[PDB]
Design a binder for this molecule. Structure first.
Ligand SMILES: Nc1ncnc2c1ncn2[C@@H]1O[C@H](COP(=O)(O)OP(=O)(O)OP(=O)(O)OP(=O)(O)OP(=O)(O)O)[C@@H](O)[C@H]1O
Ligand SMILES: Nc1ncnc2c1ncn2[C@@H]1O[C@H](COP(=O)(O)OP(=O)(O)OP(=O)(O)O)[C@@H](O)[C@H]1O
Ligand SMILES: [Mg+2]
Ligand SMILES: [Mg+2]
Ligand SMILES: [Mg+2]
Length: 292
């Protein structure tokens, strides 16, 4: 019943000209997709990027999530979440953990992979575009509790936990190649992405149209603004509030006929929206960095 959490990827370069990485491990004599266990304090996306680099030598940018694999192990259940990951270069060197890495077209990779579950992941990988741009919709971190004035507090800050969530989000949002930063017009929203701002040395663009009060007054202008931001060059992070996100995500998924595999709305959570030629092709809900 204990779950051992892991993450991994279909690491690719160049759908039918695309080549994917398949690795061999001497300890098991297996051919599989790179993956490994989450270290203490890591989220799945962070672990996937790190394990890909450790096992293949390549850096990469994560995109669409590709489902979950589980299997029994002595400790309980191994759980592995997989991402499409576009290679950003590197070099493989054989060692005792991983002695071979082959780059194969998807069909030949399917024959090389020995585990039925890995082939299922690869089938998902080719079902939709993989050369995707990414919009990251983040619910601000924990910020104590609303007071008893009507509606909303503009200046209420993140609390101690929430500041730590903000710090923990840097690596998770970097895993997806975030480049540009946007926050609703509330201090707690800005503070959630300020650590990332400092890392990227980027300014955060303030978004009055995306606060809870603005969404309730004019939802159409919020939707229009989301699309506007998404159309800009780069991979934007947009930090907003709990009454806003579910509505925005549902509306986009509905109109694009995209089915999210997970749903939630927790403070510090992230929706990874994958676009191909401006169309939504994936909506992946990630838990807060300090939650399961
Ligand atoms: N998709 C699948 N379905 C069913 N069984 C699968 C399987 N994949 C591997 N195994 C089988 O489970 C056992 C443990 O291997 P593993 O889960 O890959 O365990 P691991 O802990 O050795 O490897 P990772 O989770 O990849 O761990 P790290 O990279 O974090 O490990 P390291 O830190 O030792 O490099 C092996 O016999 C393997 O054939
Ligand atoms: N005084 C209030 N007026 C209206 N809604 C409230 C009030 N207090 C709580 N809520 C509701 O509870 C949710 C969470 O409130 P909480 O005080 O925990 O966090 P919050 O930091 O204001 O969250 P968010 O900015 O995402 O709305 C809010 O999103 C809102 O839907
Ligand atoms: Mg491994
Ligand atoms: Mg490993
Ligand atoms: Mg490891």
């Amino acid at each position: 019943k204990h779950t051992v959490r892991a993450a991994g990827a279909v690491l690719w370069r160049d759908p039918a000209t695309v080549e994917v990485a398949v690795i061999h491990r001497p300890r098991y004599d297996d051919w599989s997709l790179p993956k490994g266990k989450l270290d203490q304090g890591e989220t799945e996306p962070v672990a996937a990027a790190r394990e890909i680099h450790e096992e293949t030598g390549h850096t990469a940018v994560l995109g669409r999530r590709l489902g979950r694999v589980t299997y029994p192990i002595p400790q309980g259940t191994k759980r592995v979440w997989y991402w499409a990951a576009k290679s950003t270069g590197g070099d493989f060197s054989p060692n005792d953990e991983v002695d071979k890495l082959v780059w194969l077209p998807v069909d030949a990779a399917m024959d090389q992979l020995q585990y039925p579950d890995d082939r299922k992941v690869l089938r998902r990988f080719v079902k939709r575009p993989v050369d995707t741009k990414t919009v990251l919709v983040v619910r601000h971190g924990t910020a104590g509790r609303r007071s008893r004035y009507k509606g909303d507090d503009r200046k209420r800050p993140l609390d101690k936990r929430g500041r730590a969530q903000a710090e923990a989000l840097v690596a998770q949002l970097m895993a997806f190649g975030a480049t540009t930063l946007y926050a609703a017009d509330r201090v707690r929203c800005h503070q959630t992405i300020e650590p990332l701002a400092q890392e990227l040395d980027q300014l955060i663009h303030n978004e009055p149209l995306l606060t809870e009060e603005a969404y309730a007054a004019d939802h159409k202008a919020a939707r229009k603004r989301l699309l506007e931001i998404a159309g800009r060059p780069g991979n934007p992070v947009i930090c907003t509030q709990g009454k806003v996100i579910p509505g925005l995500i549902e509306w986009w998924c509905e109109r694009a006929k995209v089915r999210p595999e997970t749903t939630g709305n927790r403070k510090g959570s992230t929706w990874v929206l994958s676009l191909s030629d401006g169309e939504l092709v994936g909506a992946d809900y990630l838990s807060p960095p300090d939650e399961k």
